[PDB]
Amino acid sequence: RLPSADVYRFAEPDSEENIIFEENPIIKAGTVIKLIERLTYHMYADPNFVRTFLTTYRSFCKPQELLSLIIERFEIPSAELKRFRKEYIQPVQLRVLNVCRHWVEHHFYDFERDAYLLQRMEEFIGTVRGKAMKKWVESITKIIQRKKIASSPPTVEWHISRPGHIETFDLLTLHPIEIARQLTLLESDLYRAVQPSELVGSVWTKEDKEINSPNLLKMIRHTTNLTLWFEKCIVETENLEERVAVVSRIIEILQVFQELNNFNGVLEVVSAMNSSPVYRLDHTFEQIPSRQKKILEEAHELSEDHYKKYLAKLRSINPPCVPFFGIYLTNILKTEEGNPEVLINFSKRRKVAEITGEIQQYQNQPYCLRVESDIKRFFENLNPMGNSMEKEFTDYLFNKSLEIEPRNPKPLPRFPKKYSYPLKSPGVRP
Ligand SMILES: Cc1c(C#N)cccc1[C@@H](C)Nc1nnc(C)c2cnc(N3CCOCC3)cc12
């Protein structure tokens, strides 16, 4: 029934040297030729294989090479001749177009990063002149052209800085309710923009990390800037009574971060408070009320163990949420290092793809908050390091900490004020 190997490379049957399954199918390993064959199997459909493959195929196959394989598998060279066209030719051709649907619909970034890859896809779909494959070709063409063309929020809160005067925006001049709202809207968009393929194969820690993981790095370096900006506002406020107001305001921003389920912002404040320059400021935290001490304690307990307390709280809240990327990136690297690579190992890619879907399920629901473009651009313009590098700026923050609160033998100096506006916080309630 089946052709030969010279005419069709997908003719060699399954054996121990190609395709390896698990216990009861679910594929564990195999060659790329066999991975495409089972991805387009004629006896049944497998949507779980398609979604996991197209998400993790770039870890073992290249996009230009994948298109050449699905086209090679598509172009297959009368008691059985009419049956072979219905039991093998027609169903396999439908499975190839099904992958093409899922490829352009959910992984279109591969095409807008390689124009030659998209041109070949449009030429292949144009050559498909079947009869039953018409509705699939129509759907593929519609998705391609669509991709190429591609209640009431509450009142915005203001404190000292009047609206429109972006030149006076600061941590104490802006309302802490609005600081967390805009940072939540800012971080939510940075989270929703991350594609799962940017986490497969540790591509964000390799050579081409900018073009393969453009959205993940932008999410990471934003967390670094806002954390360092929190630490910079604290240590550079030499006045003790003024630094207490700075830290207390960041605790109030954590309160709103918790009301909006922005766990990235909560742990950004946590990471800034646990940093070496901020954690040793014993004189500052003594004047912080016990109510704000408990809030920082509970937020830190989310980081104990492997964020297991954060995971438990995440599984008990609802849509409007901004997850934390760190705990998932850690579990991916240990899995991508624990499991090997070849036995090629596909259960490793599946195990990594299972982790991506856990943090991806919150990438749909938006926040019922109105965007403030001036406040948004202010936080987008944040660059606390400046010209200095990462290690040189963190060493400055700690030396600034050893200066504003010298260690045990030295006394505690008194420093002049730096903020001329009132320091009383407006409030945490809308
Ligand atoms: C509550 C608070 C305050 C005050 N007041 C002031 C600052 C921070 C915090 C939180 C956010 N950090 C922590 N909280 N509770 C424990 C039991 C912690 C135990 N260990 C740490 N680590 C910090 C990093 O180096 C290793 C030790 C942090 C803890």
Numbering used by the authors: 568 to 591, 599 to 651, 671 to 743, 756 to 948, 956 to 1042
The authors write:
Pushing out from the 3-position of the phenyl ring with a bromo substituent was well tolerated for SOS1 binding, and further introduction of the 3-cyano substituent resulted in the highly potent inhibitor of the SOS1:KRAS PPI, MRTX0902 (32), with a reduced lipophilicity (cLogP = 3.4). Based on the pKa of MRTX0902 (measured pKa = 6.7, ∼17% ionized at pH 7.4), the phthalazine is not highly protonated under physiological conditions; however, the local acidic environment of the protein likely helps drive protonation of the phthalazine core. The structure further revealed that the newly installed 3-cyano substituent on the phenyl ring presumably enhances the edge-to-face interaction with Phe890 due to the electron-withdrawing nature of the 3-cyano substituent. The substituted phenyl ring also provides shape complementary with the back pocket of SOS1, although the cyano substituent creates no discernible interactions with the protein as captured in the static structure. The SAR of the benzyl amine modifications show that the 3-cyano substituent in 32 provided the most effective combination of potency and lipophilicity and led to a nearly 6-fold decrease in CYP3A4 inhibition (IC50 = 3.6 μM) when compared to that of the 3-trifluoromethyl-substituted phenyl 24. Furthermore, the co-crystal structure of MRTX0902 (32) suggested that the C6-position on the phthalazine could be used to further tune the electronics of the core structure. Further in vitro profiling showed that MRTX0902 (32) was highly selective for SOS1 when compared to SOS2 and showed no inhibition of EGFR. X-ray co-crystal structures of these inhibitors reveal a unique salt bridge between the phthalazine core and Glu902 of SOS1 that has not been reported with previous SOS1 binders.
SOS1 is one of the major guanine nucleotide exchange factors that regulates the ability of KRAS to cycle through its “on” and “off” states. One of the major regulators of this process is the Son of Sevenless (SOS) protein, a guanine nucleotide exchange factor (GEF) that acts as a key activator for KRAS function. The binding between KRAS and SOS proteins helps facilitate the turnover of GDP-loaded KRAS into its GTP-loaded state. Additionally, functional genomic screens have identified that several cancer cell lines addicted to KRAS signaling are particularly sensitive to genetic perturbation of SOS1.15 Functionally, KRAS mutations lead to a reduction in GTPase activity, resulting in a higher population of GTP-bound KRAS and increased RAS-pathway signaling. GTP-bound KRAS also binds to an allosteric site on SOS1, leading to an increase in SOS1 GEF activity, thereby ensuring a high population of active KRAS. Herein, we report the design of a new class of phthalazine-based SOS1 binders that effectively disrupt the SOS1:KRAS protein–protein interaction.
